[PDB]
Amino acid sequence: ADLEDNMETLNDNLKVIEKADNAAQVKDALTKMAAAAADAWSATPPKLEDKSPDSPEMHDFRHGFWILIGQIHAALHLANEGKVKEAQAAAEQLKCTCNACHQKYR
Amino acid sequence: ADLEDNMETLNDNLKVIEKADNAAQVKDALTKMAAAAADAWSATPPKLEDKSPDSPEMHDFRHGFWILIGQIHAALHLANEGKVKEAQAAAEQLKCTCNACHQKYR
Amino acid sequence: ADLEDNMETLNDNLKVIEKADNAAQVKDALTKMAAAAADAWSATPPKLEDKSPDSPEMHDFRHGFWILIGQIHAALHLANEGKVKEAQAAAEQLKCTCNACHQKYR
Numbered sequence: 001a002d003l004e005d006n007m008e009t010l011n012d013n014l015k016v017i018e019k020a021d022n023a024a025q026v027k028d029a030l031t032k033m034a035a036a037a038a039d040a041w042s043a044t045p046p047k048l049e050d051k052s053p054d055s056p057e058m059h060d061f062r063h064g065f066w067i068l069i070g071q072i073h074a075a076l077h078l079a080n081e082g083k084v085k086e087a088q089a090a091a092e093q094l095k096c097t098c099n100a101c102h103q104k105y106r
Numbered sequence: 107a108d109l110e111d112n113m114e115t116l117n118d119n120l121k122v123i124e125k126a127d128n129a130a131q132v133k134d135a136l137t138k139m140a141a142a143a144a145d146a147w148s149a150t151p152p153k154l155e156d157k158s159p160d161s162p163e164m165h166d167f168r169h170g171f172w173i174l175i176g177q178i179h180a181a182l183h184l185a186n187e188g189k190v191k192e193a194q195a196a197a198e199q200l201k202c203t204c205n206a207c208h209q210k211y212r
Numbered sequence: 213a214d215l216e217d218n219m220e221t222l223n224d225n226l227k228v229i230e231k232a233d234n235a236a237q238v239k240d241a242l243t244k245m246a247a248a249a250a251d252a253w254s255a256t257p258p259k260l261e262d263k264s265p266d267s268p269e270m271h272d273f274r275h276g277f278w279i280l281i282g283q284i285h286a287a288l289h290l291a292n293e294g295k296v297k298e299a300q301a302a303a304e305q306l307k308c309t310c311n312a313c314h315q316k317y318r
């Protein structure tokens with residue numbers, strides 16, 4: 001999928017996590033976020049279209065998805081342990097990573 | 107172990123995963139793959155032997171193992187949940203990463 | 213927290229893991245290490261204070277925390293399976309990563 005579609009999936013499922021009651025719901029949403037983030041990681045964003053694929057900016061963009069995916073994985077571990085509110089809090093804190101990448105590259 | 111020996115371990119255990127019936131077998135193979143990939147990550151491949159250790163090519167080579175290890179870890183999570191066929195499908199899709207690194211650096 | 217405080221947390225909890233009897237104790241310590249390492253990852257160490265934030269040295273410093281966090285996560289998986297002595301051995305081997313970063317940047 002393209003970058004915007006993956007971002008819609010990330011955005012939608014963050015809201016699913018916020019409204020969830022139980023860990024199964026949180027885990028299903030995190031799994032979809034993980035897939036969307038993995039697919040977005042291969043994108044070239046509009047503001048970097050000319051940069052060399054070996055450029056520091058493209059490498060940093062990809063590192064942003066590594067951070068997001070790592071945090072999603074941590075939230076998934078919490079969900080697997082049934083720590084719903086802790087998983088929801090980790091997902092809430094993902095937003096810092098979304099915003100940081102957006103400030104540089106969106 | 108050297109790079110070729112770790113690649114043999116990766117290759118052999120990918121076939122173990124393909125032929126497996128149950129998650130214990132898949133998990134044992136993925137664990138061996140994770141160890142081989144972690145050990146290969148420190149290798150300098152023949153086609154990069156002269157490049158500076160701080161070079162973009164050596165950094166990219168190592169990022170290739172980060173990708174592989176991340177995907178192995180995801181397959182391991184699926185195996186831990188008893189999703190044998192989903193774990194086998196994730197392992198099958200690892201091959202895209204093996205091939206991509208081979209195209210650049212083997 | 214600052215870098216030194218996060219390093220104290222890493223150091224203290226490595227000793228907790230060494231003295232632990234059971235996986236709950238090991239897991240609690242690894243969780244604190246993961247949080248300290250994630251927080252240290254954003255630090256600029258004294259010996260790199262002038263370097264550009266886009267510099268290879270700052271990027272390599274951050275990759276050192278990626279390695280540490282990955283190894284902590286592997287030890288946590290072992291602890292989750294109740295493999296206390298294997299988790300303790302993985303944590304013992306973390307020290308190679310602590311030392312390698314210290315040799316370059318401390």
Ligand code: HEC
Pocket residue numbers: 003004007008010011014045046061062063064065068094095097098099101102105106
């Ligand atoms: C590492 C980079 C990065 C991360 C992390 C990231 N984004 Fe984005 N996001 C972008 C870029 C680049 C765009 C602009 C896409 C475009 O203009 O085509 C974007 C666009 C969007 C959009 C607008 C989509 C549209 O229809 O135009 C939304 C919503 C969004 N992001 C939400 C999120 C959420 C939620 C997260 C995390 C949970 C997130 N983003 C994490 C890079 C990132």
Ligand code: HEC
Pocket residue numbers: 109110113114116117120151152167168169170171174200201203204205207208211212
């Ligand atoms: C990030 C880099 C990278 C990844 C990922 C990677 N390889 Fe390799 N692989 C290499 C390189 C480099 C060589 C060449 C080694 C040499 O010539 O000494 C190689 C060689 C091999 C060989 C030949 C071994 C021999 O005896 O000569 C096999 C088989 C192999 N890889 C299989 C795999 C499989 C299976 C995977 C994933 C499951 C994989 N590789 C992933 C870099 C990689």
Ligand code: HEC
Pocket residue numbers: 215216219220222223226257258273274275276277280306307309310311313314317318
């Ligand atoms: C990727 C880099 C990196 C890793 C990994 C790392 N350290 Fe450090 N560590 C540093 C740096 C840089 C300093 C120096 C901090 C300063 O001088 O302010 C330091 C300082 C320390 C100190 C001295 C703290 C003090 O009070 O002055 C201790 C103890 C320590 N590290 C232990 C550890 C342990 C234990 C680990 C792993 C389990 C570890 N470090 C992993 C970079 C790292």
Ligand SMILES: [Cl-]
Pocket residue numbers: 001002003004043044
């Ligand atoms: Cl795209």
Ligand SMILES: [Cl-]
Pocket residue numbers: 107108109110149150
């Ligand atoms: Cl080698």
Ligand SMILES: [Cl-]
Pocket residue numbers: 213214215216255256
């Ligand atoms: Cl600091």
Ligand code: NI
Pocket residue numbers: 001002039040
């Ligand atoms: Ni896509």
Ligand code: NI
Pocket residue numbers: 107108145146
């Ligand atoms: Ni070796």
Ligand code: NI
Pocket residue numbers: 059063165169271275
């Ligand atoms: Ni990098």
Ligand code: NI
Pocket residue numbers: 213214251252
């Ligand atoms: Ni801090």
Ligand code: NI
Pocket residue numbers: 073077179183285289
């Ligand atoms: Ni995990």
